[PDB]
């Protein structure tokens, strides 16, 4: 459960965020002082359009790439077994809840100074992109 909480929030936010910039475009393409309960109903339920499957299957990944652990025999198996169980129950929980309640809860309710340090090195990675893949293998 201790490790499960690290991802249960990664299920909600990654969806909420893709809805924060979706409400930062309908506000730029349309007026500003006019919005209804249905006009706000469409913009957030459209962030569930793209990242929707992206996380439900990715949290399906986190859980299944972990299954092979259950094949621990004896003393070791009895130990990390229950840890895998609770870790899996809680993932399939915040994933099956991030697709039934999380969308509704977010609808019923200095980013600059990090973007400026990343992209100098990002446009730089596009310099003979086969050179950075040479540095990677060295890692």
């Amino acid at each position: 459960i201790a490790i499960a909480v690290g991802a249960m929030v990664d299920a909600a936010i990654v969806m909420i965020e893709n809805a924060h910039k979706r409400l930062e475009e309908w506000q730029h393409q349309h007026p500003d002082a006019t919005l209804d309960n249905k006009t706000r109903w469409q913009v957030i339920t459209d962030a569930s359009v793209e990242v929707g499957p992206a996380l439900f299957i990715s949290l399906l990944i986190i859980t299944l790439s972990f299954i092979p652990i259950f094949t621990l025999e004896g003393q070791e198996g009895r130990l990390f077994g229950p840890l895998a169980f609770t870790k899996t129950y809680a993932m399939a929980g915040a994933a099956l809840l991030a697709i039934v309640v999380i969308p509704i809860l977010m609808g019923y309710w200095l980013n600059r100074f990090l973007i400026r340090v990343y992209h100098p090195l990002l446009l730089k990675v596009l310099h003979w992109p086969k050179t950075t893949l040479l540095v990677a293998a060295l890692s």
Partner: protein
């Protein structure tokens, strides 16, 4: 990076080549990740960090099982923002 080359900037690429147009479709699929990404890694390492401090009964086996994730969750993000991109911009060129 896929829906970036699947939006409207993906009308120029499939028809003809334009380095400084596929580079723009990547530069936006880079500032759009900045917000979700930096927080995903944050809350994953933040919610994983307390159990890395091995004080108390049982902490020993939990710190041993969190360090690989915490330490493995600094090179995984940091590197994947440069290896994944500079590798997709290379594969998209092969089939082309």
């Amino acid at each position: 990076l896929r829906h970036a080359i699947e939006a409207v900037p993906s009308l120029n690429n499939p028809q003809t080549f334009s380095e400084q147009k596929l580079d723009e479709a990547l530069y936006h699929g880079a500032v759009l990740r900045v917000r979700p990404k930096a927080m995903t890694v944050a809350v994953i390492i933040a919610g994983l960090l307390p159990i890395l401090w091995g004080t108390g009964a049982g902490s020993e086996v939990m710190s041993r099982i969190a360090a690989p994730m915490i330490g493995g969750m600094i090179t995984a993000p940091l590197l994947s923002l440069f290896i994944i991109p500079a590798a997709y911009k290379l594969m998209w060129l092969h089939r082309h």
